Design a protein around this ligand. Structure first.
Ligand code: NA
Ligand code: NA
Ligand code: NA
Ligand SMILES: [Zn+2]
Ligand SMILES: [Zn+2]
Ligand SMILES: [Zn+2]
Lengths: 178, 177, 178
């Protein structure tokens, strides 16, 4: 319901995506099929693009915003790219960062400017992934700053895709009730 | 303004409870007398039940959601249960966990799946109570993950109930406008 | 949209300030010129005043609330006071605190009761500035609790004002559409 234009850029949302009325999608946003956006989530693509893939969960009160960078006298803007089968947890912040496929950004965590969360990895709850930091494949990072705790079990990795499916099926049932 | 059905289940909100119109309540929610829910708070009972008791405050941008837990084949859904006289702080997350009576969940903190905040305890600000962890009676926990800092002094415990009453009174004044 | 009145007192918002429809402003709030408030932000001046200066940014899902401090008998209510050219970051909490001029409160951080963020200082992401804690002029604090990390370089301080202007200009373009 709050699908807002900005500078004549309107969100492109796939017809099988679900955006809850209490989420806020602004500007140059792209959302793929079966991707869900939940109450209070703000996806604000005003200063640069936000691209979200298919079958991804943007959980409640999560904020997604491109970065404005001031290390050069000319101001620079970094887009957000989020891949497929991801869980962006309750109250997580994705700030000018890249999330690849089948990964979990834990609840309340921050993934900051030019960072990259690689496929089949986890950002731990409340963790802060710093500027340009890389979360490696098959690992979980925790704390502030985010540091590697351990490798993920092969079951833990396989249940990410299963979580993405569960939450996409949930979103489908929301869609059926206007 | 956003009390929403889900799969036939409607939020059962007591008449003396206050839900700010900018809060979001969905599905199988039970909210008791004098309990307040503040702007941006999301209480989403779609995958399981959320039960909140009486005189409890769910402060701004707090999120309450049942847990989906993934066993070898079955998916376990874990309901949220929050008791009486609690302060769920600004931007806190209660996720498939249990809060008992007269406790403070501090601002920005997380109480995770299957965790338990016992009566007369505190989760400190920004702390993360990991799954199946108990915050014991009469104690504060801090940091990530949450670990015991010290005992709550006798005065500190009595001011929890007093704070809950102050916030329930504040909500009463919101209801009249 | 949600500029709510409380107990007779209505938000006093300058004509050049910008409040996004999805922000919530309640009660005894004072907002200076060129200041911007963004989706999901809550500025709730109900138990005491909140004063925000000019050219300041209250980013998405940020919460500003006065403090209720509990003494042996009486209850003290502490106002929020936020100065000029500040950045209150995505999902930050300013709770009964004082923020002076040209500072950054980092994303997801807490500035709690009777605390003070001095001019040209910086609260790190996910940090928790405790009760009555000062964030000193020229310095950056991090972690839980908030510990001084280092002095800010002269270039970094110069970019605080520039970031405030960039976001004030952004808000200007939002206000020209609706
Ligand atoms: Na189906
Ligand atoms: Na009364
Ligand atoms: Na201009
Ligand atoms: Zn931003
Ligand atoms: Zn959840
Ligand atoms: Zn408060």
């Amino acid at each position: 319901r709050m699908i807002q234009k900005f500078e004549g850029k309107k969100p492109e949302i796939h017809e099988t995506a679900f955006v809850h009325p209490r989420a806020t999608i602004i500007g140059d946003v792209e959302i793929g099929p079966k991707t869900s956006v939940w109450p209070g989530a703000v996806i604000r693509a005003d200063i640069e693009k936000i691209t979200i893939g298919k079958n991804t969960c943007i959980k409640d009160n999560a904020v997604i915003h491109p970065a404005d960078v001031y290390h050069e006298e000319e101001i620079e803007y970094v887009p957000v790219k989020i891949g497929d089968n991801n869980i962006i947890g309750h109250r997580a912040l994705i700030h000018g960062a890249k999330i690849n496929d089948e990964s979990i950004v834990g609840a309340g965590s921050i993934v900051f400017n030019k960072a990259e969360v690689k496929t089949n990895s986890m950002v731990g709850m409340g963790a802060v992934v710093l500027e340009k930091q890389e979360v490696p494949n098959g690992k979980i990072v925790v704390g502030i700053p985010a540091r590697v705790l351990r490798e993920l079990e092969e079951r833990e990795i396989k249940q990410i895709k299963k979580q993405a499916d569960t939450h996409a099926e949930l979103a489908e049932h929301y869609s059926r009730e206007i």
